[model samples]
Structure formats: C-alpha cells, structure tokens
Target: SMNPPPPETSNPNKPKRQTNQLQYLLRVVLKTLWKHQFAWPFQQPVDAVKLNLPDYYKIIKTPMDMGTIKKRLENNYYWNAQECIQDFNTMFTNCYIYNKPGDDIVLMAEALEKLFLQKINELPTE
Candidate 1:
C-alpha cells in the first residue's frame, strides 16, 4: 500500500481549502441543463447510425455532450471550475459546428450557451 504523508502546510492543523461552492454551482447547471426543453440533443452523445444520419458525423468528428460532462464532473475529471466551463463551451461549439444556422439544435446550443455564461459570471474572483 502507498504511504500517507503528513500535512504539508505551516498551518498543519487546519483543513485544506476546497472549491466546494464552485462545484455546487456547476453541479446545479448540469441538472438544470438536463431538464431544459432543448436538452434532448445534448443529454447524450450523438450516434449517426442509431439515428440513421450520416452527414452529422461527417462534419463533426469530435463531440461533447451533457451526459459525458456530468460523468466527468462526478468523477472529478475536471480539476477546476474553468475546466468544467470549457467542457460546456466545447459542447456548445460542437453543436454549432455540426448544425447550420437556424437549425433547432444550433438554437438550443445558443440558448444553453447563453444560460451557461449568465451562470458562470457568478464565479467569484479574489
């Protein structure tokens, strides 16, 4: 088994700081997004064959979706709030890239991206 080391700070008796508040904030975003009216397209990864679509995948080789993001968030795959934010950004960008202007999902991405920005602005800076 690996050894556990002693605390590394001068204030060794104090508990280490955590970004719990930001984590909670981002977590709230996920649940809200999952239930949004336009959330269906992003709830999971795109499967062209399952949906019987070929063009979608031809344009979008890489994709991002809420389910994967939620999984990563739950797994602590994102090391910071910005990283999580970036994941949502990529999800939106991927949608935009795959769908044309005025497409339903593109509009959905726009709506969700705006919502994301509005929420992320609440991030505190010190």
Candidate 2:
C-alpha cells in the first residue's frame, strides 16, 4: 500500500501574477521566426545601440573570400546574402531607433548597400 500523501502547503493569500498576453505572443513569434532564420534581421539587436558608426561599418563590410560569398548567396545555405541584408537592416533600424547620429546611420546604410552590391556582382548571371 502507498503511504499517505503530504498535505498541500499552498500560498493561498498570495495574489497571482498577471501575465502580459502581448508580450508572450511577441516572444513566441520572435522565437519561431528565429528558429527558421526569419527572426529580426540582426545578429544582436542591442548592438545597434551599442556600436558606433565605424564599428558598424567594420562589421558590415568585413571582406569574405569568394568561396564564403558564394556559399552565403546559395539558397541551400542558411546564412545567405538575403539573410545578411536582413541582419544589417535590423541593426540599422535598431540603431536609428536609439537615435544614433545621422551621419552614422547614413554611413552605415551606404556601407551596407555597397556590401550588397558587391555580393550581387559575385553571383552568376542566369
């Protein structure tokens, strides 16, 4: 025979914490998107607020050899050119939101555009 179970010791007087539905939904959506590589564009959203223009440019423009570039541009790969663009765009958008200097934003945008163009040029013409 099983022994008698212990009495329940609950905090009946304590009020239940309210959950934020919107926040929960947002987290779920973001998590799902991220799992499929479709989440917010940036590798790190907070970097937008933390990094300066030069820093952002350096990260966005780091030179990749032709092999790496081709792999990224290919559809079979997860880290494709489109994903890179989205990541940059997300960083740019967040940085803009944090009120980064106008010059910095413009410089970052221009650098990102050039990077995209460079990658596009590398792709074989269909």
Candidate 3:
C-alpha cells in the first residue's frame, strides 16, 4: 500500500519567504567586513541592548567604548581556528553559494583572517 494523502493540500498562491533571518544578518556582516576593511560596530553602553548585540566585549569597555565583532572570527569566539572557519563557511556559503549569488569567496576569507590578526593587536591587554 503506497497511497499518498491529498498531495499535502498545498497552497500555491502564497509568496515564499526567506526563513533564516540570521543568514541575512550574516550577509550584512560580511558586507560590512569587506567595505570597512577592518572596522566594526563599536557599541555604546546606552545602545547595547537596543542594538541586540552580544555582550561579551562590553566587559573590557576601553576608553573608546568600541567593542569588536571580528574578534569572534579570530578564535571562532575563543581562539579555535577550525571553529572560526566552520562558522564563516556556514554563514558565507549560505548567503553566497546556496542562494545563487556570485561573491568573492577568497577575498572574504582573506579579509576575515586579516581582520582577525588586526583585532588581536587592537585588543587592550594589561
């Protein structure tokens, strides 16, 4: 018995939507990395929760009040290179490859590594 049930009762008139909003955010982040060349959004204390950014960097709170996003890319959040690559691949490939868009994949990888090094230097160390 191999009967299929009512073809799942499909509704064909509805517009398809991109379900993964995080992918969209990753695209914006990648674009920002490319355009800025080594810059990132340095969150202000007043705008922390308002902007919905992760709060790890806020602990340092240097005089500039500039927290970094790319540092996570360095160690993949804790200095693991492999994890970083995996995360980047997941994010960038979803936006660039799976979605049928042409992107500078090599450039993005290079920029990320370069930014990672720069961030290491930029971090305030006592």
Candidate 4:
C-alpha cells in the first residue's frame, strides 16, 4: 500500500505573509493597459456595477463567492493562471467595448494575450 508523505513545516526564518498574486497579476495587466493608454481617461471612483463580480464568475464558469475568489487569489498556494486569464479577459473585453476607439482597446487586448501566453510558457509542464 502507498502512503502519503508527511506534511512539510514552514521555515522559521521566512516570514509568513498573505501573497497577493491575483491582485499583482491584475495590476500588471492594468498597468500594461494604462501604459498603452487603454484605461479610463482619468482617475475616477470605481463603479461597483461595472465590476460585477457575479458576472465575472459567470464568464469563468465558477460558482463561488467573490470574497472566496479574492481570498484564493490572495494566497500564492492557490494559483490558477488560466482562470485568471479568463477573468481578466471578461473584464477587459467589457470595459474595452464600453469605451469608444477600438484601436487602443485592441492594443490592450493583444498585450494581455501576449502576457498570459508568456506566463503559460514559463510554467513547467507535467
């Protein structure tokens, strides 16, 4: 019979902290869009309606609370790059279409696509 190995312990020297992987990834995508002038014209209060978390979940085909999603994304141990790409794509597409001038939006979409592809390339294959 096969037995599982014992769980590993954390290193005392390393500080324990919550990792904001999803937030960082989102920021990187947003930063890239901003750099390419694809974001809103100016800083404004975020409209919660526009950022409907439920809609995001629907697009990603996941039925979970937004808080849980946020928590999972915050933890490095719960990395899901593919799901994140879907989420980003859904949001970006909606936002991109909402605003006019498709030229900049196209660049933003391309940048996100390339970045996610690069991310996948860097991952180890089974």
Candidate 5:
C-alpha cells in the first residue's frame, strides 16, 4: 500500500486583520463627530491670545483638539480606540476647565461629548 501525503494545517492566527477593521470603524465615528454643527469649537487649537484667556496656558497643560485628532488618524498615529478617545476626553475636560458652566462653548462641548460617547459605546468587542 502507498503511504498518503501529510495533510496541510490551517493557520488561523490573524490578529492584524481585526485591528484594521476596528480602527476603520473608529475613524468613521470620528468623521461623524467632525460633521456635527458643534464641532467648530473643537476643530482647531484654542487661540488664547484672541480669546483673552492668556491664563489658558497656565491652567491647561496638555491641550487636545479635533483638528489634531484628525491629523493623527490620517497619519495612522493611533494604535487603539482608547488612545483616540483619550485625546477627546482631554479636549472635553479642557473645555470644562477653561469655560464657565452654562457658557456657550461649554454647552457645545457637552453636546459634542454626548454624541461622541453615544457612538463610541457601540464599538465592537475584540
């Protein structure tokens, strides 16, 4: 009797594939946030000089904005979902710290945050 050839094994350790999909989904959610009307305040870096909030630098050490976040996403700077959300949280916290309660900018920041959290919670579990 002739001996049979060895069977091929199926390799299934594709970890990179799923990472790409999750990041893409995260990017989609980010773009949606950018499209929001209240996105203006977080679009660019805060101009402390123009706003007369010179103390902005003294009070806020690390500043984050949607513009910078978009750039980072575009350049593939983020490795995980939390990394991107960290920046968003920083931006939101900065708004709360620098702006007074009931202020227009503060309200907008809350609105944007509400939307961000709403969609962020829907992320797929890895």
Candidate 6:
C-alpha cells in the first residue's frame, strides 16, 4: 500500500498539458490504502479504514512529486497547520490499526501502527 505505480511523464513545453504530479502521487497512495481496506476489516474491534475519495481529492489536488517530497523533508516544511493533522488522520487509519480486545495486542498494534504511520508521513507530498 505504501508504494505507488510508476509515474507518467508529461511534456514540459506544454505547461497546461501536464498533470499535477504531486496530486497524482497522492491519489495513487490513497487508492492503494483503499484497495487494501486498511487490512483491518476482520479484527475484533473492527478498526476499519474509511475515506470519501472525492473529499480527499478536494483537499489535496495541489501539484507535487518525489522531488517536492524530498525538498519538504529537507526543509522541515509544513504548508499549513492542517497538513500534519490531516496526515495523522489518514496514515493512522492505514497503519497500526487494529481492534483486538487483548491489552497486550492493542499496545503492540498501536505501536506498530505508529511506526507505519511515520513511514507514510515521510512520503513525498510535492
């Protein structure tokens, strides 16, 4: 779910003809998460993943790609206060997400989820 499909190249000379690479990357990531259903539907407590695809697009249609993501991380950049919060919500839903009743399992699950979330958050947003 973390990896996206190979990127499509655009013609640099025709500016408007090009797609927003960043948005494409985000969509690929989002679709991967959706395809996997967060791998949690069968868990006891059912911490399943959910998202309105249209809404997600509305929120993150800006242009970006791998270079952009790398730059942001290098600069410790955050475009808006909502960015981190939104990211936390999405990544948490996809990772360390379990709903088993055992205390030990819950703790372990949460920790694992957090780790995966960190990886996802580190992805290029540009």
Q: What CA RMSD would you report for each candidate? A: 10.4, 20.0, 19.8, 12.9, 16.8, 12.9
lDDT winner between 1 and 6, please give it: 1
Give the Cα error of residue 27 in candidate 4, in Å. Answer: 12
Window of ten residues with lowest summed lDDT in model 1: 1-10
Question: What are the lDDT scores of the predictions, listed in order?
Answer: 0.68, 0.36, 0.34, 0.42, 0.72, 0.36
Highest-TM-score candidate: 5
The sequence of per-residue lDDT tens digits that candidate 3 reaches over residues 1-126 is 121121111234532332223232234443445456433322212243454434523432321211222333322232233333344444333334322333453454445646544543333322
- Check candidate 6 and list the clashing pairs: 22-64, 64-126, 65-126, 69-124, 96-113
- Predicted candidate 1 versus true structure: per-residue lDDT over 1-126, tens digit per residue: 122231121333433333764476446778767778989988777766677766765676556778777776665555467666777887898887776899988888888877777777766662
**Candidate 1's C-alpha lDDT?**
0.68
Could you estimate the TM-score for every candidate?
Answer: 0.75, 0.28, 0.25, 0.35, 0.78, 0.26
Model 2 vs. true fold: TM: 0.28
Misplaced by over 4 Å in model 1 are 1-18
The local lDDT score (0 to 100) that residue 1 gets in candidate 6 is 11
lDDT of 1 at 110: 87
Across 71-101, the per-residue lDDT of candidate 5 in tens digits comes to: 6666556557676678889999998998899
Superpose all Cα atoms of candidate 2 onto the true structure and report the RMSD in Å to 1 decimal: 20.0
Runs of candidate 4 exceeding 4 Å displacement: 1-72, 75-79, 96-101
- The candidate that wins on lDDT is 5
Q: Which ten residues in a row are the worst by lDDT in model 2?
A: 1-10
lDDT, residue 12, model 6: 41
**TM-score attained by model 6:** 0.26
